[PDB]
Amino acid sequence: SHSMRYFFTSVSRPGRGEPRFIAVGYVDDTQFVRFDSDAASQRMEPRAPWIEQEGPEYWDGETRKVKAHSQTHRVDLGTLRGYYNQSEAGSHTVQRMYGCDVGSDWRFLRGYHQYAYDGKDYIALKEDLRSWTAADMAAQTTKHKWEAAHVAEQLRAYLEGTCVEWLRRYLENGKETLQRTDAPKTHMTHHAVSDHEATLRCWALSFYPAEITLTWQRDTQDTELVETRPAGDGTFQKWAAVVVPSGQEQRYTCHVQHEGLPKPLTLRW
Amino acid sequence: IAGITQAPTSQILAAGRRMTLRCTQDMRHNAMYWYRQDLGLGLRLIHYSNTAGTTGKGEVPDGYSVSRANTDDFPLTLASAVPSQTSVYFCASSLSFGTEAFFGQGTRLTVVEDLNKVFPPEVAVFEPSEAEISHTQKATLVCLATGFYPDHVELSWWVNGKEVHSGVCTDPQPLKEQPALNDSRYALSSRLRVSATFWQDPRNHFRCQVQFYGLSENDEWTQDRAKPVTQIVSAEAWGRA
Amino acid sequence: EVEQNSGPLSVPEGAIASLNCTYSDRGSQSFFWYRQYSGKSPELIMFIYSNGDKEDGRFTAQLNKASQYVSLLIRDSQPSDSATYLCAVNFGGGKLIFGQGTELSVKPNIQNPDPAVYQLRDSKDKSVCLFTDFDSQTNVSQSKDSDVYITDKCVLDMRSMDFKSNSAVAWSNKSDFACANAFNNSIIPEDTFFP
């Protein structure tokens, strides 16, 4: 029912200068902290009004951690470049994601922790939170080092403990933002394509959270479905379209499922 | 034996002098730390380094600097030592920040206004009382080290040429002979208790040895009295019937 | 910060000792108990990072992050448990903060106390007063005279005789000094033998 996630991106920039490191934190689909190694402040910064009430010990601590991660990912970039025999001239990317889900009762549901190299899976914590999956043989080296250091035990304690507890804290402190459910505003548009062909577009606007499903029903897996996109004010938008065969044989309908809707909506032209 | 070592183990330093405490580890630990320990304050964090190539300020960083160019070393520099930096300094390292920290041996550092206040101890051994012998059938010898400054001493008992630990008890810390003086000299006491018959045997030899850590060879000394360098001062007593 | 009682705490030899540590930062995620003997460096006893109890031989650690405390339990206290016990707490990003430490003193039961104050002469005019053979609950205080020196009490163990005894010494450079007046500022047993 709710989730907290941290996303880390590290990029080597050999032709341009020092590496770049960006960290963002989300609760559900609401970002609440950021750190950009290219920015001037060099501190973790708030991005949601409910996190601003955290005291200076919180901001100092998160800044210390994220600054260490920035340095350490520079070493990782060099290590992985060695593992894969890659030259020093190319730009490469390391990404890390971790966090926890809680159910409707706000109790621990599952934890996550994964790394990617150049946008492909590298190593991931298994669902049981006790062992690792290495995507190729190079990542087995990293697996063996993390197993010898008992990383999974400390990580499991975080994912089932601190992660869940602070997620609950954020959910209460920002309940007016995080526990809301804005229902989709739905409408349909028709536009003529040819003399004997048209297109119907099923819209959905100003909804939160981003999870939504739009399906067309003549009574169809040959349609266009754009990615859910942010409006910019904390809600989301999405549409789907059908290429109807005739100018009037258009007895299709789209169904809109979203937790802000007690029953799935039905739209017709 | 991959571990962590500090150096030097003890140091006497004139005020205003530069000094670097060394700390190295071959455990490939990424996090390292510096603490000072003082009476009533426990360990206070001076500087930390959560990863090779970075350092950060602790609870009491003023007057100290560090560097972490490499994983292994983490030197602590006192640019211009002041008496308040007299302390015991502990280096520590952990595999990563957030994991268990392992400590080095510690460095006992004293900053003095002038090396002319450094004095070696006088050592005396006080023989057991006849009343104690006939009242408890035991014999306690007391060793008294007095008049030394600073308090960097180690006391040990030797019986017939062999160091003993049974029946030995030593004051944990030396006491100040003039508490009002901030540069007061110190005194330290120890007891060795043996059988009445063992002390009454004239063949048994008793010796108290006091290791004093003082000035080094790289110290200039132009005063009258003999130079108070690191030395061992001893006192003796033979058994008697 | 990190808060412990300074002590010193007494525990009878063989009995249970309990130590407590509180901390202020809700964000703290790892906790450590260290033991430190005098003149020595802290040695790790136990780490803990999950709520609940953790057992390691005679030692049990208990962590409650919701209540912001961590505790250490020592069963069957031995003489080697006499030490300072240090609580350490990670505040984030390498800021590892120690409490002031709790000194623990494991007190042996004196079999047959025979409190007495003896005067010992140097092998060479000077002398020291030896207060010895008192029970482990006797407190040896300092004199109100600035020119009199008294050490703290201290237990020695004659291992072959299976015997233990507490002692403190006193001395002074002045010659008004008599061993009867040496420990007047301390609570001394009324039956203390003065030869």
Partner: peptide
Amino acid sequence: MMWDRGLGMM
């Protein structure tokens, strides 16, 4: 709040 541990490819 972020996990309080460093972690890398060592």
